């Protein structure tokens, strides 16, 4: 590869998506990992690890933030308004579970915008079938966080999921795929520059999208109860 005008426009597209990633979402991964690790910021979160800790601590919001970020993707607002709703209808759950891995470690998940922290084992100890609600998300997060993506990687990765040309009921598929092809080019370059150690990380990220649709499929089956 070389540093040429096409490469610079892909990096400028990456920077634009990252700035919108920050403006649209309050709690990013960089601040999430800082809270979960030692370099914590302000007030420490209230850990909920059993029933007693639940008492002394006693999705709709994310849908609005993701739509705000989708409006900043170049060309998304110019699509047919019905297709814009269709892309966000079948993709918002895949985004939320991707953002959820940023707030997760092997012990639990960050809740209440970092004010609380509920452990993984306490969520599994809940009564059936509520004990199986968050467990598929943790198993995905352990594998997903093993890729060690940052906010710059996730910003473009979130954009590729939105511009999925295979959503049911898309009136105009071709212009959607032309944007995703541009997003895929920027995501490939972003991963090669930011991850000199991960062989075929671009291929591994695309395979994670198949795992995301299996979570949403499994989550809807759990919601029919």
């Amino acid at each position: 590869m070389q540093l040429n005008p096409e490469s610079a426009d892909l990096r400028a597209l990456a920077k634009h998506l990252y700035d919108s990633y920050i403006k649209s979402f309050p709690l990013t991964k960089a601040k999430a990992r800082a809270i979960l690790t030692g370099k914590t910021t302000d007030k420490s979160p209230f850990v909920i690890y059993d029933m007693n800790s639940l008492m002394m601590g006693e999705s709709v919001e994310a849908v609005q933030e993701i739509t705000e970020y989708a409006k900043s993707i170049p060309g998304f607002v110019n699509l047919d308004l019905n297709d814009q709703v269709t892309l966000l209808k079948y993709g918002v759950h895949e985004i939320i579970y991707t953002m959820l891995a940023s707030l997760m470690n092997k012990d639990g998940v960050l809740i209440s915008e970092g004010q609380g922290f509920m452990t993984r084992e306490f969520l599994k100890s809940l009564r059936k079938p509520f004990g199986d609600f968050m467990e598929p998300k943790f198993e995905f997060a352990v594998k997903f966080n093993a890729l060690e993506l940052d906010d710059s990687d996730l910003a473009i990765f979130i954009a590729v999921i939105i511009l999925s040309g295979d959503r049911p009921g898309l009136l105009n598929v071709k212009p959607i795929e032309d944007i995703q092809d541009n997003l895929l080019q920027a995501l490939e370059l972003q991963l090669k520059l930011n991850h000199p150690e991960s062989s075929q990380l671009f291929a591994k990220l695309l395979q994670k999208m198949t795992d995301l649709r299996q979570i949403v499929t499994e989550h809807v089956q759990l919601l029919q109860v």
């Binding site: 849908v63 409006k71 607002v77 709703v85 918002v92």
Partner: peptide
């Protein structure tokens, strides 16, 4: 909800 999406646009 699709109704929440068909609003922020």
């Amino acid at each position: 909800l699709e109704a929440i999406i068909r609003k922020a646009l």
